[model samples]
Target: TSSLETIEGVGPKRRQMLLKYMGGLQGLRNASVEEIAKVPGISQGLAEKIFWSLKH
Candidate 1:
């Protein structure tokens, strides 16, 4: 979690949003950027960034 906390663009708000939207890391891995971006307050660009960040 601390390592996650250190990731670029992953502030506390975004972290919580990611966790909530994706339903945790496993769920995030199972989701596409389009799906993740549908969460409230999340944008397409942010979703793509998050996806690529994790995808790589």
Candidate 2:
């Protein structure tokens, strides 16, 4: 999660946007790659990465 904070162009506002669109981290955890890609600033690759990282 801190890695997300370190990403370029993704500050608090963008984090909030991501959380809002994804309905928070829990929602993000359940989201599919196709679904997450629809959110702004979130690409299909990134979505897949996120999914697998938290898949446990």
- Clash counts per candidate, in order, are 0, 0
TM-score of 1: 0.58
lDDT of every model, 2 decimals: 0.60, 0.56
Candidate 2 structure quality by residue, lDDT tens digits, 9-55: 45456544556886677776666566556666667555554545343
User: How big is the RMSD of model 1?
Assistant: 4.4
Give me the displacement of residue 25 in model 1, in angstroms.
1.0
Q: Pick the candidate with the highest lDDT.
A: 1
Q: So what's the TM-score on candidate 2?
A: 0.51
Q: Cα lDDT for residue 17, model 2?
A: 53
Candidate 1 lDDT at 29 equals 61
